[PDB]
Amino acid sequence: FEKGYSQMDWLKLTRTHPDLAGLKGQLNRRLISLEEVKQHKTGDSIWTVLKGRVYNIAPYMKFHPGGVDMLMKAAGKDSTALFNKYHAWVNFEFLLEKCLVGFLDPNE
Ligand code: HEM
C-alpha cells in the first residue's frame, strides 16, 4: 500500500481498460440532454454533468479521494455546484477525459 496513489492508479486504468466511458462504439462528441443524464443513475453507468461535459463516473468511484458516498451525490444530475464547493481547482477535464460521453446541450 502507498498513500496518495489513487489518481496514478486511475490513469493507469484509463490506459489499460477499454471503453471506460461505456459508449460501446458510439462517439463521445454527442449532444446530450439533461433528461438523458437523469436516466443514468443505476445499472451499468452513472452520468453527471461538469461545466457542460457529460461523464460516466461509475468507473471512477473507487478512485475518488473524497469517497464513493460523496461522488454518488453527482449521479444523474449537474454536479458543477457540488464540484466547485469541494474542489473547484481539480482538473476533471484531464482526469475524466476517457469517461467523456458528450456535451450537455440545453436545447436537446
Ligand atoms: C466528478 C468528478 C470528481 C473528481 C475528478 C474528483 C476528484 C477529487 C480529488 C482529486 C480529490 C483530492 C483533493 C484534491 O486533489 O484537491 C477529491 C477530494 C474530495 N472530493 Fe472529489 N472529485 C469529483 C467530484 C466530487 C463530488 C461531486 C463531490 C461531492 C458531492 C466530491 C467530494 C469530495 C470531497 C469531500 C473531497 C475531500 C474534501 C475536499 O477536497 O473538499 N468530489 N476529489
Side-chain angles (χ1 to χ4, degrees), residues 6-7 48 50 55 57 60 63-67 69-74 79 82-83 85-87 89-92 95-96:
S6 59
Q7 302 313 282
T48 196
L50 291 169
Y55 296 101
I57 51 169
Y60 187 64
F63 301 89
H64 178 231
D69 51 350
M70 296 305 293
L71 190 59
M72 276 289 176
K73 296 179 176 312
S79 61
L82 280 165
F83 186 90
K85 171 187 181 203
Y86 287 103
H87 41 55
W89 59 88
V90 162
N91 195 342
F92 71 86
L95 289 170
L96 297 182

Side-chain angles (χ1 to χ4, degrees), residues 33-34 36-61 63-76 78-107:
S33 67
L34 189 66
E36 280 183 77
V37 171
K38 289 177 166 167
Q39 294 174 77
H40 292 255
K41 295 176 175 176
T42 59
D44 67 359
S45 56
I46 291 166
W47 286 11
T48 196
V49 190
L50 291 169
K51 295 174 191 201
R53 296 172 184 228
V54 187
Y55 296 101
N56 174 22
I57 51 169
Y60 187 64
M61 286 288 159
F63 301 89
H64 178 231
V68 173
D69 51 350
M70 296 305 293
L71 190 59
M72 276 289 176
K73 296 179 176 312
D78 193 300
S79 61
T80 305
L82 280 165
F83 186 90
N84 283 342
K85 171 187 181 203
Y86 287 103
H87 41 55
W89 59 88
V90 162
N91 195 342
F92 71 86
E93 296 96 334
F94 176 78
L95 289 170
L96 297 182
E97 178 44 43
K98 283 313 212 139
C99 295
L100 181 72
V101 298
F103 305 118
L104 194 89
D105 181 341
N107 312 101

